[model samples]
Target: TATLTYPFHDWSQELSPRYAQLRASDAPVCPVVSEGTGDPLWLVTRYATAVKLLEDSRFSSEAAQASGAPRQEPVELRAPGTRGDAIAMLREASVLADGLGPRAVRRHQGWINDLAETLMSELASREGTFDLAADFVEPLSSALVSRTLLGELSADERDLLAHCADTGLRFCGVTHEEQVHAFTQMHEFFLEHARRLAGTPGEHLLKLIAEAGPLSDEALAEAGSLLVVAGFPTSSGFLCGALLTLLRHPDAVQELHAHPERVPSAVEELLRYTPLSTGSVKRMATEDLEIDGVRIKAGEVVMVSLEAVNHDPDAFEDPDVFRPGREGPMHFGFGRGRHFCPGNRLARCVIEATVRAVARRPGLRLAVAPEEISWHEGLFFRRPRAIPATW
Candidate 1:
C-alpha cells in the first residue's frame, strides 16, 4: 500500500465523498500509511469488522489516541489507571445506572425534558434569528452533561469551565506545545472543582464522585476535564445533527410531532442516521491479531470508520435512508462491548426531548438555504459548525 496523505483541513471538498471512498466493497480493512509521519492505521469499514474490532480485548483504547490531555503527554503515560481512560471515567461519573439505578435515570430524564422545554421556549420566544448550534442546542447539551454530574454550576464556574474546556479541546486535535498549556489549564480547573465535590453530599454522580474514597484528586480532575472536552461536544453535535435531519425531511418531523409513541424508535433511527462520532474510538493492537482475515501486527494503530460501518449494506436494509422503527440489530453509534457509552441514556433523553420540543415549535424552519449550512468535522464528533434557524 502507498502512503496516502490527504488534506484534512479542506472543508471546500467536503467530507461526504471522502466518506464514500471508505465504504466496504473490495476490502473490509484498508491499510494506509500517513505521509511524512508514516503512521500505520487500518481503516475498518464493515459493520461486522467494526463489531469485531470494537469488542475485541486485543484492541486497547489506552493508546496515544486517548492522550493529548490533563493536557500533558507525561500525565497520560504515567497517571495511575491512565489518563487516556479519562473520558471513560467521566462516563462512570455521569451515568449512575449501576450506582443509583433506574429511578435516578427517570429523575434526570424528566428534569432534562423540562429543562429542554424551557430552553426551547426561550428560543421560540425570541423575535428574530437564532443559531441552533450556538444559541440553542449547544447550551442545552452542556447543561445536561454538567448538571447531571455536578448538579448546577454557578455562572462563574460555567464560564470558567468553558474556558478550560475550549483550550483543552483545541489541543486535542493538533501536535503543538500549547497542548501542554491547554491541559494545564484544564487540570487546574478540574482539580479545583473535583475537590469542591470531593466530600460534599449530593445526588447521583456528583455525590458518588464526592464519596469515591479511592479516587485521587488528579484522577478526578482528569475525568471531569475529559467530560467537557469530549462528552458535551459529542452530545451537542448529535442533538443538532438530529434536528437537521428532521428539518430536511419534513415528513419525519411531522410524524414525530403527530405520533409521540414513535419517539423511542425515532431516537434509535436518529442515532443510526447521524454519525455523531468522527470515528468511534481509536485503538492500538495489544497483541498480534487477524480481524476478518486481515493480519494486524502487534502494536499497530487502527481506526474504524463507524460512519461507514453504520452505513454498511449488510448492517441494515437501506442503510442511508432514515427509517424510524428499524427492526435490525442495534447500530454501533454508541459503540460496542466494554467501551459502550455509559451516558447513552442521557444522550437519548436529551435528544428525544429536544427534537420533540422543536417539532412542536411553531414556524420552525431553516433560516438559510440548506446549501449555505457550514459543517465542522472532527474525529470525536461532527455537526453544522453553525446552523441559523428560527421558529
Candidate 2:
C-alpha cells in the first residue's frame, strides 16, 4: 500500500470546460491520480455512472474500516470506555434522518424566513453600500445555523459559533498539525456545549439526540458537533452563489421576483451550475466491482466528481447556460441514495427564502468586478473567499 495525494489544481477554471467536453462526448470516465499510490482509479464523471455508484451497496461508506483506506482523524481523542459498537454508532446517526422529513422541512423553512427578516432588519440600519458576502451571507449563515441547530445560544454561544466558523476557515490553508489543532479547539467548544445541553435539554435537534436512549453519550456529542459545523456552511455557499449568479443574470432575477414560484427551479439550476460541493461523496469499493468498464478492487478509494457529473452535457442540455425552469432529474446538490444529505430540505428552504428576500431588493448587483473575486480553493469544498456585492 502507498500513500496517495490528489493532483490538486485550481479547479474553478479547469472543471467547467472539461465538464462541457465530457458531457458532449457522453464520456463516462475521467482521470484520477493514484498519486504515488498503487493504482489510479478512474473517476466516474457521467451522471448515470455517478448515480449508479452512489446507490451501489458494493461501494461502501464504511470504508474507513477497510485496509489501506484513509481514516478521518476524529476531531478529538475519545475518552476511555467510549462505546465502540459500530452498529449502534451508525444507528445514532439515524437522527440525521429526522431532518429529511416533510414536517422538519417546513419548520426549517419558517425558521429561515423569520431569521432572514431579522437579519434584513439589522442590515437596513447600516444603509449605504455593503459587501453581500461578508455583511449578509456570513451573519445570516451564522445566525440561522445557530438558532436552528444549536437552539437559542446566549451571547457567548453566538460568539463561539462565530469563532468556530472563523477557525474552520483560517485553518483551511494550514498544515495537517495546525488543522488538527483547530479542529480540536472547535471540538472542545462543541463538547462543552454538548455537556451543557445534556444538563438542560432544549427543543432542538441537539436535545433530541441527547435524549435518544439508544445512542451512546459519545455518539450524541459527536453527532451534535458534526451538525453545528457542517449544517450551515454549504448552504451559505449555495445561497451566496445563487444570489451572485442571479445578480449576473438580472432577467432571471426579475423572473424570480415576478413568479416567486420559479424560485425553486431557479435554485435547482443554480445548484447544477454553481454547485458548492466540489466532488462526489467519497466512497470506497468494498469488493471487486466494475463501473463503466473500470474495475475497482476492494480497499480502493473511488471519487465520484459531482461537479463533473452535474454539468455533464449528456445529462443537461446546454450545460453552461442557466435555465430557470429546465426540466430534468433533481440535481445531486444534496447528493443521492441512502447517504443523501439529511439536511437538504432545510438547506433548500434557507437558500430559497434568502434568495427570494434578496432578489426583491432594488438595485442589488455585483459590487466588485468579477475578476476581483477570489475563490476559496480545496477539492472537498469550493466557495467564494468573499463575494463583494452591492444593492
Candidate 3:
C-alpha cells in the first residue's frame, strides 16, 4: 500500500527523474501512492493518459465533495461555495473574450495593460533590490486578481486578500496546526465579505453571483476564495519565472528582442519550461482501468503531475530543452480537456505582455547571481523566493 502526504512527494528532486523515465517508456506510467492506508493509486505521468483522463468526465474535480478527499483543518473558512465565486468571476469575465460583442477582449486587455503599467511603476522604485516574491510578485498579483475578479475591493478587503494569498501559500509549507490558524483567519475575513456582498452587489463577480441566484452562500464564497488563492499566485509565479528564464538564457532573450512578433510562441515555450504549480488536481478512478499496464480500481485516487506531462518527451520533442517555436506546445501548463483552467487565456495574455515589456526594456540585467536564488517548494507551485534584477 502506498501512502500519500500533503506535499505528495519531494518535487525538486523526485520530479525530474520521474519525468525522464515516463518520457522514455514505451507506455505511460507514473508512480502511485495509496489513499489513506489503501493500496497505491497511480500517478499518471504519460502525456496521453493525462490528457485523456483530464478530458474524461469520469475523472472529477468534485473531489472536494468526495468523502475521502483531504480536508483542511478547521478554520472559520466559509464553504467552497464562497471560494467558488472566484471561478464564476472568470466565467463572467469571459464575456470579454466574446468578440464583436459589447463586452470585448479590448476592454479586459485595456484594464490589464493599465494595471501592468501601474505595477511596473510601483515596483520600479524598489528595482535593483527587492524580493520579487514578496515585494513585487505577491502584492501585484493579488491586487490584479482582486481588482479583476472582486471588482475593486475596499482597502481592508484587499488586505484580507493579501493575507489569504500568503496563508494559502503558507498552508503548503507549515504544520497542519499553523495552516489551520492561517485558514481560520482567512475564512473569517472572507465570511464577513461574503455576508456583506450578499446584501450589496457591485459590478464584479460578487454582483454576478447575487444575480445568478439559487447558489448557496457557501458556494459563492468558495468560488471567490478560489479566485483569490488559485488565480493570483499561479499567474504571478509564471510572470516571475518567465522573466528569470529570459534573463538567464541570453540567446532566447536576444531572439525575442529581435523578433518581438514571436512573443506568443515564446510565451508557450516558457509555460512548458517554467511550471508554476508543482503538481496537484487529484482524480479518482470511476471504474476498473488499466493505464500504462497498471490496474487502477474504482474509487482509487490518481494524481496528475502537470510538470511531468508537460515535460514528457513523447508529447514534446527534447522535453528537457527550452526551445520556443520548436513546435507547438503539447504541454498542459493550463491543463487540457475539461477542467482546463478557465483563466488560461487571460493568464497567457498577461504573461505575453510582461515578456514583451521586459524584452523591450533597455539594458535589463540580473541584479543577483542565479545560483544564489532559492525556490519555494510544495505541491501547489514552484516559485522563486526572490528575483532581483535591474534595467
TM-score leader: 1
lDDT of 3 by residue, 56-123 (tens): 67666655325444332122233332343344444542432222123423446676666666666666
Residue 96 of model 1, lDDT score: 37
lDDT of 2 at 351: 79
At residue 46, candidate 2 shows an lDDT of 76
lDDT of 2: 0.63
Computed on alpha carbons, the lDDT of every model, listed in order, comes to 0.66, 0.63, 0.62
What overall lDDT, based on C-alpha atoms, would model 3 receive against the true structure? 0.62
Better of 1 and 2 by lDDT: 1
Question: Which pairs clash in model 1?
Answer: 71-183
For 1-391, candidate 1 gives per-residue lDDT tens digits of: 4544422332221335545576644766776654324555677777888888888889887653554321112123222344546645655544334543456568777777887788888887777678887877867876776566655677677666654544334313444444456567666767777777544555636556557436667767776665566566677777878878777777787877888888889888888887665433567887898988889887777776666677777879998888886877888778888767767777777888987787786468878877788865322356677778876
- For each candidate in turn, the TM-score is 0.85, 0.84, 0.81
